[PDB]
Design a protein around this ligand. Structure first.
Ligand SMILES: C[n+]1cn([C@@H]2O[C@H](COP(=O)(O)OP(=O)(O)O)[C@@H](O)[C@H]2O)c2nc(N)[nH]c(=O)c21
Lengths: 145, 750
C-alpha cells in the first residue's frame, strides 16, 4: 500500500460525541469504527421517509430507517438515522452521498454509535434539535425561526 | 526520516519539475547505502500504484541509475520478481502498469533495447500456445501494444527488423480473434455517429497510425528529454530471459472491453482540436484519466481537483475529455470499476469546480446521449436513468424539456418516450407528485408519473357483493383494536373455501390498506403479523399468490412494492424462487418493460448471493478454528481438547451441508430465472414467425437485453453452472437468437 493513496478524509469520524452515551470516550472510538449506522442533518421538515430511502438506496440496501421526531409535537425535526447491513456499504454512502443536495437542501452525514430506544427524539429545549434554538435566520424548510 | 522518504517520493509529481527531479536524486543518494532495500520497495510499489505519472518516476530511476549503476542492477531484478509474482496472483490490472514502466526505462537508458525486444517476443509468442483460453492470448498482445506509445520511436529504430516480425505475428493473430463477444459489450449497436469496436481493434489501428507517421506524438510528456546529457553516459541493463507463467486452471484473466466514443472534434469548434478516434494520443489521455479515477476514487474532492489539473491541459480540451471518461467509467456494463453513485456526485463537484465551461459541455453531452437512445443497451439505460434523475435532483429539476418535444409523436414504447417516462418517475421518487407536474411543460402531461395512492379492492363505497366483504370489515375493526394473531385466525375461519386463495386476498388487502401511511407502518404490520403470513402461505403457490394480490394494492406506487417484497424475503415469508416466478407471471406482463420490476429481481438475487457468502464465511472461520486448535494442541499436548474438537467437528458438518443446501438454493434460483426466461422469449419468437411480424420490437429488444444484463452482473457465480446450463437449458435445439446470448457469455471469459 501507499500512505497517500490510502488516505480518505470521509470515512473518519467527526469530533461529535453523544454525551448521553454510557461509557468513556474510547468506547465510542472503538464502537464508531465498527458501526453500520450513520446520522444525517438538516433535512427539510417536509421530507418523507420514502425520499431518504430512495436517495440512500443508491449506495446499497437499507435495514431500517428511524425518523427523527419531535419530543412533544411527534413531528419530523429534519434528521434521521440510517442503518446498513454491512459497514463497507455504509462507507460508500458517507463518501459520496454526504454533502449532496436533497430536496433542494444540502445534507450532512456523520457516523453514529448505534440506535437506542428513545434516542430519536430531539434533545433541544423546545423539543427539536438543539441547533434550532440557536438558529436565527429564516428558512421554510425548518419551519421558520 | 524513515517516514520522510515515501512522502517526498509522492511529492515530486504534484506541482521546476526537472529541477525538482534533480534535487530528488541527490537526497536519495545520501541515504542510499543504508536504506537501499527500503528505497527499492518504495520505487517498486509506486511503479504499479501510480501509473498516472510513470514518466516522472522513470526519469527518477534514470538519474539514480546514471549516478549509481549498481543501484539499477538489483532494481530491475527486483522489478521482475514483482512482475513474476503478480502474474502468479492473477493481478493483471497492474501487471500492464509494470510492463509499461519497464518499457519507458529504455528511454532513460536504464534498459538495453535489444533485451526489451526479446521480452516482447515472449509476450507475442503466447499466441502460439494451444489449448489456452483466447482471453489470455489477448492480454499479452494488449500488454505489448499498450506500452508502445512510450517506447515507440526509440525502440523501433534500434531493432526494427525483429519487431516487424513481431508486428506481423500480432497482426496475424488479430485477424483470427473471436469477435462473438462484442455485441454484448458495445453500448450502441448503431455505427453512424461513432462506431464501437473492441479495444484491441481500436488500439491496433491507433498503433498503425503512430507507425505511419514515424512514431511522433504531441500529447505525452517526456521529462527525460531535458536530462539528455546526463543519461547518455548511463550504462544499460540487460533483462533476464523472462518467460510467461504457464497457463493453469485456477488462472483468471481480465475480461475483454470496448472503448466507446461520444465526441467528435466538430463538437467543439472554438476549442483546441482534440485528437481523433483512431489517434494514439487520445488513447493515452483516456488511459491516464482512468487511472486518476482509479487512484482517488475514495476522495471525490481530491479526485475532481486532480483530473481538472491534468498535465498538458493547454494542448487538449479537458472538459470534453473528462466528461467522456466519466461516462466511459459509468457505462462499462460488465461492472463499473466503482460504485455507480460515485460518478453522479463526481460530476457535481466538477461542475462547481469549473462553472465557466463544464456545465455547458455536460448539458451538451446529455443531449447527445438523448439523441442516440434509439440503439442503446438497456442495462446502460438504467445507469443513465439513475444518473440523470439524480443530477436533476440536486439542480432544482431545471431542464429544457421543450427541446425533447419529439418524444410525444412516437410510439409510447419507443426508447425516447420511455426514457422520459422513467426519468420523471425516478424524479418523482425524490420529490412530490405535484412537484413534478409543475416543472414539466403541460404538453408532456401524458408522460408524467401517476399519483402513488393505495388501491383498496374492498372500498367502502365500491360494492357489497364482493365475496368476503363481510369478513373484510371484521378485519378492519380487529386491526384497529390491535388484535392478537390467534384471534385473527378465528376471523379467517369464516372465509368460504372455493389452502384458500380467498383468505390470502382478504387478509392482504385489508392489512396493507391499513398500513398505507408509510413504510414504517407497513414494516411494522408484517412484523406484527409475521406468523399469520407463514401459516397461510405455507404452499409455494400460496406464497406466489401473496405477491400478486400485493401488486394489485400498490400498482400505482412502484417504490412501495420495491421495498415491500424485500422485507418479505428477509422474513422468510416468500423465498427468492417465488419472487422470480411472480416477475414473469401474466399479471406483470403489461408492466414487464417497466424499470422497477428489474430492480426487484436484482435485489432478490443480491440477497441470495450475499446470504450464501456469509454462510461460506462462517464455515471458513470455523474451519480455521480447527487449524488454530490443532496448532496449539501440537504446541501444548492437552487431552481435554478432544471433546472440544468434537463439538466443532459436528458443528462444521452442519455448516457444510447447509452450504450445499444454500448453494443448491442459489443454483435453483438462477435455474428458475433462465428456465422462465426461455419460455417467454420462445413464445414471442414463434408467434412473430407464425404471424410474419418483425422480431425486432421494443418489447423484445428490452427483454432480450435484460437476459444479457443478468448474465453480466453475476458472471462470476454463473461460472459454476456451465455444465448445468449447457446440458439442460441452453442447448443446440434452442433458437439461435436466444442461444447467441449464451454463445457470447461463455466466450466472454473463456
Ligand atoms: C449534531 N448531532 C445530533 N445527533 C443526534 O440528534 C439528536 C439530538 O441531537 P442534539 O442534542 O441536538 O445535538 P447536540 O447535543 O450536538 O446539540 C440525538 O439523537 C443525537 O444523537 C447526532 N448524531 C450523530 N451521530 N452525529 C451528530 O453529529 C449528531
Amino acid at each position: 500500500l501507499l500512505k497517500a493513496l490510502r488516505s480518505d478524509s470521509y470515512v473518519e469520524l467527526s469530533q461529535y460525541r453523544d454525551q448521553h452515551f454510557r461509557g468513556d470516550n474510547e468506547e465510542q472510538e472503538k464502537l464508531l469504527k465498527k458501526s453500520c449506522t450513520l446520522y444525517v442533518g438538516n433535512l427539510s421538515f417536509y421530507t418523507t421517509e420514502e425520499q431518504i430511502y430512495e436517495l440512500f438506496s443508491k449506495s446499497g440496501d437499507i435495514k431500517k430507517i428511524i425518523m427523527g421526531l419531535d419530543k412533544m409535537k411527534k413531528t419530523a425535526c429534519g434528521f434521521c438515522f440510517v442503518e446498513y447491513y454491512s459497514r463497507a456499504d455504509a462507507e460508500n454512502a458517507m463518501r459520496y452521498i454526504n454533502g449532496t443536495r436533497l430536496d433542494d437542501r444540502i445534507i450532512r452525514t456523520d457516523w453514529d454509535a448505534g440506535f437506542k430506544e428513545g434516542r430519536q427524539y430531539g434533545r433541544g429545549r423546545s423539543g427539536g434539535q438543539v441547533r434550532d434554538e440557536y438558529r436565527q435566520d429564516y428558512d421554510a424548510g425548518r419551519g421558520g425561526y | 526520516t524513515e517516514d520522510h522518504l515515501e512522502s517526498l517520493i509522492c511529492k515530486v509529481g504534484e506541482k521546476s519539475l526537472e529541477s525538482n527531479l534533480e534535487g530528488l536524486a541527490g537526497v536519495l543518494e545520501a541515504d542510499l547505502p543504508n536504506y537501499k532495500s527500503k528505497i527499492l520497495r518504495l520505487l517498486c510499489t509506486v511503479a504499479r500504484l501510480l501509473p498516472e505519472k510513470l514518466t516522472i518516476y522513470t526519469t527518477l530511476v534514470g538519474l539514480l541509475n546514471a549516478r549509481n549503476y549498481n543501484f539499477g542492477g538489483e532494481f530491475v531484478e527486483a522489478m521482475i520478481r514483482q512482475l513474476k509474482e503478480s502474474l502468479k496472483a492473477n493481478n493483471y490490472n497492474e501487471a500492464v502498469y509494470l510492463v509499461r514502466f519497464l518499457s519507458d526505462l529504455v528511454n532513460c537508458h536504464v534498459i538495453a533495447a535489444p533485451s526489451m525486444v526479446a521480452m516482447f517476443e515472449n509476450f507475442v509468442s503466447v499466441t502460439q500456445e494451444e489449448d489456452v483460453p483466447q482471453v489470455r492470448r489477448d492480454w499479452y498482445v494488449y500488454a505489448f501494444l499498450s506500452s508502445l506509445p512510450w517506447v515507440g520511436k526509440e525502440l523501433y529504430e534500434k531493432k526494427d527488423a525483429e519487431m516487424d516480425r513481431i508486428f506481423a505475428n500480432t497482426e496475424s493473430y488479430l485477424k483470427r480473434r473471436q469477435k462473438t463477444h462484442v455485441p454484448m459489450l458495445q453500448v450502441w449497436t448503431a455505427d453512424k455517429p461513432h462506431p464501437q469496436e473492441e479495444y484491441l481493434d481500436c488500439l491496433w489501428a491507433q498503433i498503425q497510425k503512430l507507425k505511419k507517421d514515424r512514431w511522433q506524438e504531441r500529447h505525452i510528456l517526456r521529462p527525460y528529454l531535458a536530462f539528455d546529457s546526463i543519461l547518455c553516459e548511463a550504462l544499460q541493463h540487460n533483462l533476464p530471459p523472462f518467460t510467461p507463467p504457464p497457463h493453469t486452471e485456477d488462472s483468471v484473466y481480465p475480461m475483454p472491453r470496448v472503448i466507446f466514443r461520444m465526441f467528435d472534434y466538430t463538437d467543439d469548434p472554438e476549442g483546441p482540436v482534440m485528437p481523433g478516434s483512431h489517434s494514439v494520443e487520445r488513447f493515452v489521455i483516456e488511459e491516464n484519466l482512468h487511472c486518476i479515477i482509479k487512484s482517488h476514487w475514495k476522495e471525490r474532492k481530491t479526485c475532481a481537483a486532480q483530473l481538472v489539473s491534468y498535465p498538458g491541459k493547454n494542448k487538449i480540451p479537458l472538459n470534453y475529455h473528462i466528461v467522456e471518461v466519466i461516462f466511459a467509467e459509468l457505462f462499462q456494463l460488465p461492472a463499473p470499476p466503482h460504485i455507480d453513485v460515485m460518478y453522479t456526485t463526481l460530476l457535481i463537484e466538477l461542475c462547481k469546480l469549473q462553472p465557466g465551461s463544464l456545465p455547458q459541455v455536460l448539458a451538451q453531452a446529455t443531449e447527445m446521449l438523448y439523441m442516440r437512445l434509439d440503439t442503446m443497451n438497456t442495462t446502460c439505460v438504467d445507469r443513465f436513468i439513475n444518473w440523470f434523475s439524480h443530477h436533476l435532483s440536486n439542480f432544482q429539476f431545471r431542464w429544457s424539456w421543450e427541446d425533447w418535444s419529439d418524444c410525444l409523436s412516437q410510439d409510447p414504447e419507443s426508447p425516447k418516450p420511455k426514457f422520459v417516462r422513467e426519468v420523471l418517475e425516478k424524479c418523482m421518487r425524490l420529490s412530490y407528485h405535484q412537484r413534478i407536474l409543475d416543472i414539466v411543460p403541460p404538453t408532456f402531461s401524458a408522460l408524467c408519473p401517476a399519483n402513488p395512492t393505495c388501491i383498496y379492492k374492498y372500498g367502502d363505497e365500491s360494492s357489497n357483493s364482493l365475496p368476503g366483504h363481510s369478513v373484510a370489515l371484521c378485519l378492519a375493526v380487529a386491526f384497529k383494536s390491535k388484535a392478537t394473531n390467534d384471534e385473527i385466525f378465528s376471523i379467517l375461519k369464516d372465509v368460504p373455501n372455493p389452502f384458500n386463495p380467498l383468505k390470502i386476498e382478504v387478509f392482504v388487502q385489508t392489512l396493507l390498506h391499513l398500513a398505507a401511511k408509510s413504510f414504517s407502518h407497513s414494516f411494522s404490520a408484517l412484523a406484527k403479523f409475521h406468523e399469520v403470513f407463514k401459516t397461510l402461505a405455507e404452499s409455494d403457490e400460496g406464497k406466489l399468490h401473496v405477491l400478486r394480490v400485493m401488486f394489485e394494492v400498490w400498482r400505482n406506487h412502484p417504490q412501495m412494492i420495491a421495498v415491500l417484497v424485500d422485507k418479505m424475503i428477509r422474513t422468510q415469508i416468500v423465498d427468492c424462487a417465488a419472487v422470480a416466478n411472480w416477475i414473469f407471471s401474466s399479471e406483470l406482463s403489461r408492466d414487464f418493460t417497466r424499470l422497477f420490476v428489474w430492480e426487484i429481481l436484482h435485489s432478490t438475487i443480491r440477497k441470495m448471493n450475499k446470504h450464501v457468502l456469509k454462510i461460506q464465511k462462517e464455515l471458513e472461520e470455523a474451519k480455521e478454528k480447527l487449524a488454530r486448535q490443532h496448532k496449539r494442541r501440537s504446541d501444548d499436548d492437552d487431552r481435554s481438547s478432544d471433546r472440544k474438537d468434537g463439538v466443532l467437528e459436528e458443528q462444521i458438518e452442519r455448516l457444510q451441508e447447509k452450504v450445499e443446501s444454500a448453494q443448491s438454493e442459489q443454483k435453483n434460483l438462477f435455474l428458475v430465472i433462465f428456465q422462465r426466461f426461455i419460455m417467454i422469449l420462445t413464445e414471442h419468437l414463434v408467434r412473430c414467425e407464425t404471424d410474419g411480424t418483425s422480431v425486432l420490437t421494443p418489447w423484445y429488444k428490452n427483454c432480450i437485453e435484460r437476459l444479457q444484463q443478468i448474465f453480466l452482473q453475476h458472471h462470476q457465480i454463473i461460472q459454476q453452472y456451465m455444465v448445468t446450463l449447457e446440458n439442460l437449458l441452453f442447448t443446440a435445439e434452442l433458437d439461435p437468437h436466444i442461444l447467441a446470448v449464451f454463445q457470447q457469455f461463455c466466450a466472454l471469459q473463456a
